[model samples]
Target chain A: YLFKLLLIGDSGVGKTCVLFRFSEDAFNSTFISTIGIDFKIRTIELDGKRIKLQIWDTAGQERFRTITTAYYRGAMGIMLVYDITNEKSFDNIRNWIRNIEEHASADVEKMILGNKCDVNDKRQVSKERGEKLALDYGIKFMETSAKANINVENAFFTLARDIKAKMDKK
Target chain B: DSVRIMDRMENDFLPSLELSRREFVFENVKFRQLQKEKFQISNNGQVPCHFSFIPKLNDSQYCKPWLRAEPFEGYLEPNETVDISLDVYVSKDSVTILNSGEDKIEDILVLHLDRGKDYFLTISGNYLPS
Candidate 1:
């Protein structure tokens, strides 16, 4: 079985870094903008079942906002990511959440993430703030840094587990 | 005798319909899972009847992508019973079928008759986490 998951946030928030690390376990410090959309596939065994996960890394550019809606239509799980060091980026997560409701399925599973946690010295969005917002939205929350590979695996595993459980129950 | 013959002809020229169940409620349906339930459709009329499904809502896209009515249309003779299979499957790729705490789905199915008022069958279910 295959599941499609989307990574979305403001541009330059390291969405590509997270996907690169999760999909390949490799990280690059260099920053490059996603032109449109790119995806990677990985298969894992959970509960003795072979599940293939299709992770889509999207372009966060304002110009591509219209195209992202089409991608959201087919996704079952979504990761709303933000740079912890950038407070403005973190604040924009609410806008992303609103778009999810307007464009995605009514029931899509969601996770809120504060990325770049490895740069603790430059952190502008505190863990407490992230947790508070997640509580208000009633979604799972995590702090991850694709560069340091901190909590990256845990974030993916938690969301995947939730998606799998939902699928199995159905 | 002539009067009796005419009365019998008048009554025998029309068809009738009946359903085994009209409303269904399901519990614990999984997200993006495919499940099926069936109900019997019996033709109780005098002549054969042709039945098909027509979207009753104002929206043209009211039908769900997960739903399918097998043998969408068919004919049934007087007193003949045919099984109408309603297949409901939520695709794993559909972002719309969220696996949140608990999600409820509601749909109304209308069975259109070549003759007579349409038959309305409603199927609803709740989805739970795995």
Candidate 2:
């Protein structure tokens, strides 16, 4: 009934924006290294079942790396995000993935998200490249635009669906 | 005395602890040495309680290198008093005092009781770097 999800990546890769748009249908107009932004919750129906998702946002600052990584121990699902316009953010997803492997459970569900897809002119990383990496890693992938609210719901819903399926099997 | 401590916890009421001081300070500290301060914590309730330091909000509970807690976590008997000493260290790694003139350490000492009042005891203090 309840799932704990984590948003992690490079410091400014739109993780907080995705979290806000998906969970609250609102955006953080003035985003900062959000401290004390407690867990966010959203209830949704999937395949005639009610599932509530509890999402955690990280401060993404180097000083907060310890505590942020500490929060990964209990996560059921993880959304590894990166900026489409910033190729460096995409490359660091590997480090994030490794961190999850060290902290989260062995069977924890995971997916890759390429955020800020609406910025076509500045988009340095292509969607095909993201999907290819995700494919190689055996994880689902998607491009999201939190500013335009495009695929924001789909990204979360897809992850939640996969997580429920994984849980049901176990 | 042992029987009474155990007996009190078995009754309807639960165990709890109260900190005598909420803030501690260590000023004009010297380098390569440990600066220590002691605070009295008491089990004021009818039952004995288990206590530990819990970090929440915006602080690290484990005050490493810079600050350390002796007898960091343990239990308290009913109406028993224990003094915990927090040792602040100024060294090469903990140089907040060098640039900022001071460093602040904050944490919550949590008292765990089955039915008693389990609340956060907030502690904050300033330590000068050497």
Candidate 3:
């Protein structure tokens, strides 16, 4: 019940690397890969609401594509990310969203992040394209660069703000 | 006559050795979670005890873990009277298990030792001195 937020993205999308920047303000280039699932705690205040976030980070590999039944309980938010340079990574967004819808709380908040935005020369997906996908899915979307520390703050704050918006209206 | 004796040893044998001040040293590298430290004991009553443990992690992928237990070996059985205790001493990131609880007792740790790679375990809770 401590504001559980799960981060799901395609493989090699820098979910772990970005988290360190946001949480600890550090980045490791040859960062080791994740095995299964990992979690970190971050406290943020937005609109006077102090949110204690328990962030769950999942491995990006297909071989580890299973979540036990108990994992579906009480999830309030999901950070769905993908590599902008890999078109297929962008394509698999639906699977991530579908899984969340099937197992997460019906009221779960979702965000789509197009990572590696700092590597502009290699950018494959356009910002407009990401925004289009976000609109179609009825979710908020943004691109982030964990290496350069760009939009890292906005990515989290925006998600927190939107979740609060939903709570207040209810 | 010998067959029955072998069966008894295999079925009912759990032991705990008296730990000297701070001497047990075994380290596993694969699951070393930030140099995690802990103390453990097996209540198998045999001079030697059997022990197996799994580390707890919030998100297993990020943490490194390593495990080590003593007296290097142990035993157990299906059913019997049971009461065991243990103690621990810790400094910063080090831990030492003091006693296996019951001074000296012979008991079974496993009824039918699995034919495969599976193993059994017995642990004694530690009550630090007040």
Candidate 4:
């Protein structure tokens, strides 16, 4: 079965870099806009079953709200990324979560990411806050830095492990 | 052919003060007019000492689309905006510019300033209506 996962985050959360790291193992220094929705594909084996994951990256601008439903059509998982250095983006996560709740699958899987973990020097959102929100929402919490490859693999791996368990229960 | 021509034209203009793709390719004419008439307001006073940022390219990624903009953490009155002064210089460095709303994006003269060059900008007046 195709596991369609989607990424929804405020602007500059490094979703595009995450795209580069996973798909091509490369990174770009500049910020390039994702016009509407773009996807990167990967396949992994879990419990002797093939898991084909197609991750969707969506534009975060408010103006795109009118046409975003087209991308949410079949999203099984939704990843919300916030810059660890920008607490305002963390605060905006709540608004983004509420937005996904309105448009995505009611039973859609969820992940919260404090991206740019390499910039721990300028940290704004505390680990406690991340854990607090994860606990509140009952979902996976991750901190990843696509630049340094910190927790980038682990974030996706942990979610896959959890997905296996979540599926077994169903 | 047209794409290369547009790209060539893009290289001719200045980078720091040039508009974003959305603003330049999408709204070029109005963007230039706004560039002609610009303003700045400073609260370099006893209260709300607006932390001023000289038009230096402290962060350049903002010049490109899809990057995070460095917020102007400058201080304003308890409830006032600190605008860019009309006498600021336009240097080669990058700048962050803002206005209140979309309609104002054109009519409000919200042009990005350069670091070394000088330009004029209008500061909105403080209101005290009866």
Candidate 5:
């Protein structure tokens, strides 16, 4: 089985970092602009079935929003990420969700991620706030720190499991 | 006996095509400036051949705004050749993304022929910052 997942949020929200940590198990502190939409593939065993996950990372800059929305189609799952250190990034989650509703297919699996949770000293968004927002939308939520390797794996695994269950029903 | 028959059938269905060039090199491509090049693909087989161009960056399917090809897919008759125009332009929106880290541009273009072996073309260029 194959599933397509997307990582979307504001710029500097650690979307690429989460992707690298999950797919490559490595981290890079330096910042580089993601050119349009780039994807990585990883295969995992779920319910004794080998599933290939094609995780796409979108350029979070405002200029590329128009181009990135086109990719939302045909996606099986989406990870809406935000940097906990920046309140503005957290606020933009609503906008990203709206974009997904407008472009993505109905019944697409969605998850909310509060990235950079390792930076407890500079954190601006609380875990309870993140949970409340996820509950409001009826989506699963997790706090992940790509640098510390916290919940990065579980977040992807959980989202993939939901997507697989949905596919099995169809 | 079955394996030998299948091998013979595969050879008979293979399309004969010739590429005029296998690589494109652009030197000192300035930001937002357009650079164009042309190459020819001729069908040397007896039957009409359908073809398409699939561009890739690092073996993944993503939009490469700085690179483009005209007549992306088409058909060719025996002894007929089609000229494919390749363009490279770094627009204002893409300049920062391209110039942020890499000064070199590289991509692979797969020329897929129906029921035939696919051909590859290498596209490389130097990004000149304005």
Candidate 6:
């Protein structure tokens, strides 16, 4: 089975970092913002079935909205990410969710991610706040640190499992 | 008689040519950046070779408008070679509704030769918007 997932959030929210950590199991501190759409493939074993996941990362810049929104179509699942160290990034998650609601399929699965949890000293958004937002939306939530390799794989695996279950129902 | 016949058959030959490269790969190509590469086609046989590059008829494999080959058609004399310049320029508007799903370029340029077999030149590139 093949699943298409998307990463969406404000710029500098560690969306690309999460994707790289999950796909390549490697991390880079140097941040070069994504300009367009990029994708990576990872296949995992679930219930004795090999599931191929095509995860797409989009540019966070507002100027590329015309190009990035087109990618929302056909996405089986979407990961709305935010930076725990930046409150503005966390605040913008609602806007990104609205964008997804306007563009993506109605039944598309969604998961909220609070990234950069490893930087506890400079954290601005509390873990409770992230959980509250996720609760408001009734979506699954997790706090991940791509740099520290914390909960990155589990976030992806949990989302994939939800999507797989949704697909099975259909 | 056999020797003479063999020599005569060798003389009545079609144009035989060799391409310097069968594929052109451009990596990390930036938007609106002019990326150029060249390939040479040499007429190795003892006859002139006439070649023309035409678009692939398949919609999915058709050559992209951003990719261009200078001197799209030409001839090469025996023992002579011609350099074909390939240019790739990705315009912002090029990533619109028609091809928004495609982030990489993949196409084939069909090289048609007179009285000879056709060849394919694969052109591929990864586009970076930044």
Q: Compare candidates 4 and 5 on TM-score and give the better one.
A: 5
Model 1: residues with Cα > 4 Å off, grouped in runs: B1-130
Q: Which stretches of candidate 5 lie over 4 Å from their true place?
A: B1-130
Q: TM-score of chain B, candidate 1? A: 0.77
lDDT of 4 at B73: 30
Mark the 10 consecutive residues where model 5 chain B has the least summed lDDT: B1-10
Q: State each model's CA lDDT, in order.
A: 0.77, 0.72, 0.58, 0.56, 0.81, 0.80
- Residue A84 error, candidate 1, Å: 0.4
True contacts kept of each: 0.00, 0.00, 0.00, 0.00, 0.00, 0.00
Give the Cα-based TM-score of candidate 5 against the true structure. 0.60
lDDT of 4 by residue, B1-130 (tens): 0123332342233222211222211122222122222234433223433232332123333222211123333444533443332221222221223222222221112222221111111223211111
**Share of the reference A-B contacts seen in candidate 6:** 0.00
| TM-score for chain B of each model, two decimals | 0.77, 0.64, 0.20, 0.18, 0.82, 0.81
Better of 1 and 4 by DockQ: 4
What is the overall TM-score of model 1 with all chains considered together?
0.56
User: TM-score for every candidate vs. truth?
Assistant: 0.56, 0.63, 0.57, 0.57, 0.60, 0.59
> Model 5 Cα displacement at A89 (Å)?
0.8
- Candidate 5 chain A lDDT trough over 10 residues, lowest sum: A31-40
Worst 10 residues of 6 chain A by lDDT: A61-70
Candidate 3 lDDT over residue span A31-77, tens digit each? 86654455566777767666877676766776445532234465678
DockQ of every model listed? 0.01, 0.05, 0.02, 0.02, 0.04, 0.03
Docking class of 1: incorrect
Instruction: Report the Cα RMSD per candidate.
Output: 23.9, 11.8, 20.6, 17.2, 12.3, 16.6
Which TM-score value belongs to model 2?
0.63
Local accuracy of candidate 4 as per-residue lDDT tens digits, A1-170: 46878888877889888866765566777867654455556665678786766677776665554445555757878788999999988999888788778878887888898999889999999988987998898888989888988776677656666667777899
Residues B18-50, model 6: lDDT tens digits: 778867898877777899999988988778888
DockQ of 2: 0.05
Q: State iRMS for model 4.
A: 17.6
